[PDB]
């Protein structure tokens, strides 16, 4: 059965989405960055997140398949997203939905 | 005033093919009974919702409308507006067809409830026996909802819905056989025109039998095991989200209303302010029609009231304490009542 790490705007599983199911395979490691649209994504920053994920699974993982490890990966991605969202690549969506600043309020960098 | 006659004649005065005229009067009562059915559902929901608050020194909805009058309106409109979800391995045909199967025959059994003489749809010579038949189709829809769901949690509690519904139809049948003795047949008009000045006094036991078998149609907290919220969450309903859950909800309350109206017509009568009525003429017919309708609704309301009032008085029973009513208290007693009524009609054929 699945072994997942469901934070906000990072959901990681251990199967292969065929049409909307997941089908745990033990080796596919899907990802679902920001489903709820807390952030407005570009084509570049999202690729940076993708590459971080790829070089964070393969480059440093050779131990068991616990939820501990996937949760650690999700934490590293959710900190990388802070970095992208502070530096100013991506930003909040502003839409008339919730607008809760889960990551941070806007600063000015004095 | 034979509204059928004037509707057909006035419509036959401008032509329209008199056979076609007799054809075009069909949908009017057929939808009027849907109107009063839906209204009875709304009323039953609001009634339970306020009386379950009176029992507890509580106050039900008063901010919806004046007094919660528009609460089931909000519920229904929402459940229309909600998303529907078809889970992973569940079947597509059976999932959205279970609730239809369990809801339809309860509506279809409104072709026998009188509300007044010649104020019903098509008095069938079979009548109540057709209700006993159509009520046995619900377990198929319940098992459909159980099988058509990957939720073992559901199927484990949908089989016990086809264990009580398949258990409280035999005494439910015997208690109405005991009425079929007296009334020369099975039609509701014949069950009730036998009362001209009531069967409860001569069926003091079958009343309890019918009334316990009717409450226990997967309805009320004395049993209602397949929706045992505490034992196992909503049983077979927990994967039904939007309008399908509304179909189940609707079905429960409309079946309760049908049970109340049917106890009224069987054992008390949808007429008969208890004096021998018709001892005291269109303007008089329109008066006694309203009087009979009103008294029918009085007794139906009293039974709805008692039914909802057991829900908050009577903790449930597991499944063995339940099925030791059927085949151990309702079925032997129904047989005894049937034999008693038979012997008494053989000895004292008067009064039956």
């Amino acid at each position: 059965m699945l072994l997942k790490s469901t934070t906000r705007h990072v959901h990681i599983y251990a199967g292969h989405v065929v049409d909307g199911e997941v089908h745990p395979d033990t080796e596919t490691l899907t990802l679902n960055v920001d489903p709820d649209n807390e952030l407005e994504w570009n084509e570049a920053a999202l690729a940076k997140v993708e590459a971080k994920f790829r070089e964070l699974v393969a480059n440093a993982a050779g131990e068991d398949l616990t939820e501990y490890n996937l949760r650690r990966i999700g934490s590293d991605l959710e900190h990388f997203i802070r970095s992208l969202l502070m530096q100013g690549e991506i930003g909040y969506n502003l839409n008339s939905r919730v607008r809760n600043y889960s990551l941070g309020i806007p600063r000015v960098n004095h | 005033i034979d509204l059928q006659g004037q509707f057909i004649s006035a419509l036959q005065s401008l032509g329209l093919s008199h056979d076609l005229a007799k054809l075009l009067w069909l949908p009017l009562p057929m939808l009027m009974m849907l109107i009063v059915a839906t209204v009875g559902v709304l009323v039953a929901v609001w009634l339970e919702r306020k009386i379950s608050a009176a029992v507890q020194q509580r106050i039900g909805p008063e901010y919806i409308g004046p007094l919660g009058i528009l609460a089931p309106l909000a519920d229904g409109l929402k459940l229309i507006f909600k998303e529907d979800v078809l889970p992973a391995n569940s079947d597509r045909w059976l999932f959205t067809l279970g609730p239809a199967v369990v809801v339809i025959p309860v509506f279809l059994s409104y072709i026998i409830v009188p509300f007044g003489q010649n104020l019903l749809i098509s008095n069938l010579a079979m009548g109540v026996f057709l209700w006993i038949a159509l009520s046995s189709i619900a377990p198929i829809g319940l098992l459909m909802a159980g099988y058509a769901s990957n939720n073992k949690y559901s199927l484990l509690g949908g089989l016990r819905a086809a264990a009580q519904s398949i258990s409280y139809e035999i005494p439910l049948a015997l208690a109405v056989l005991a009425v079929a003795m007296m009334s020369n047949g099975l039609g509701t008009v014949e069950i009730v025109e036998q009362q001209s000045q009531w069967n409860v006094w001569r069926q003091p036991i079958g009343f309890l039998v019918f009334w316990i078998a009717a409450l226990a149609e997967c309805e009320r907290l004395p049993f209602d095991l397949p929706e045992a919220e505490e034992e196992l969450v909503a049983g077979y309903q927990t994967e039904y989200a939007g309008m399908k859950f509304a179909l189940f909800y609707l079905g429960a309350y409309v079946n309760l209303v049908l049970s109340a109206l049917l106890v009224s017509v069987l054992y008390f009568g949808g007429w008969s302010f208890p004096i021998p009525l018709e001892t005291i003429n269109p303007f008089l017919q329109i008066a006694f029609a309203v009087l009979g309708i009103t008294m029918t609704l009085i007794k139906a309301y009293f039974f709805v009231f008692l039914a909802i009032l057991l829900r908050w008085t009577v903790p449930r029973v597991r499944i063995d304490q339940l099925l030791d009513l059927g085949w151990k208290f309702l079925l032997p007693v129904g047989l005894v009542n049937l034999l008693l009524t038979a012997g008494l009609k053989l000895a004292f054929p008067v009064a039956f």
């Binding site: - | 507890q56 509580r58 009032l309 057991l310 008085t313």
Partner: protein, 193 residues
């Protein structure tokens, strides 16, 4: 052997019917007793003389003792001072409490020597965002609500403030007082015989 079985059967049946009708009459009796419901938004309930709602704050009485941080379970209140050099005085430059984190233990209120930091009867706190609960020095004083002075409320006292023997607080005279005499009245009574 067999007749006794049927009699015990009927006895169990009758006892069950009786013990069901008992609860029936009980519930049918509860539906005349008045609802003890508190129709809140129009019939709000009055808090006590010690309820711990929102914290208050004056800017002029603080002296930056840092007791509030040193005593809170989680070191919450954000005191910010600069120590002007007239002689020794710590100048208080900013003061906030995040009420999305505060626990309302009021030890802050308990150990503030200046009687600057107090509890108010505001229990109606809510936002669409948690970065609005971070109340500033000028948003913590802010003169609390006082339920009674609301044109669309019927206030109710709670069980400790109702006359002796009385239990509910709904349909009450307009001169009711708590239970008994204040100690001042008892003293002036014993002094005057």
């Amino acid at each position: 052997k067999f007749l006794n079985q049927i009699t015990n059967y009927a006895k169990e049946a009758v006892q069950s019917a009786k013990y069901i009708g008992q609860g029936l009459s009980v519930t049918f009796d509860h539906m005349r007793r008045r609802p003890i419901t508190v129709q809140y938004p129009y019939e709000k309930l009055i808090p006590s003389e010690r309820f711990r709602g929102r914290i208050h704050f004056e800017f002029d009485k603080c002296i930056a003792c840092e007791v509030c941080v040193r005593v809170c379970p989680i070191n919450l209140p954000v005191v910010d001072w600069v120590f002007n050099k007239e002689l020794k005085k710590k100048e208080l430059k900013h003061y906030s409490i995040d009420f999305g984190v505060c626990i309302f233990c009021a030890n802050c209120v308990e150990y503030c020597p200046t009687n600057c930091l107090s509890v108010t009867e505001e229990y109606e706190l809510a936002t669409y965002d948690r970065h609005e609960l971070n109340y500033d020095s000028v948003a913590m004083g802010r003169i609390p609500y006082k339920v009674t002075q609301d044109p669309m409320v019927t206030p109710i006292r709670e069980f400790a403030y109702l006359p002796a023997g009385v239990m509910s607080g709904h349909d009450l005279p307009a001169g009711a007082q708590r239970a008994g005499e204040r100690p001042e009245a008892i003293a002036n009574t014993a002094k005057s015989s």
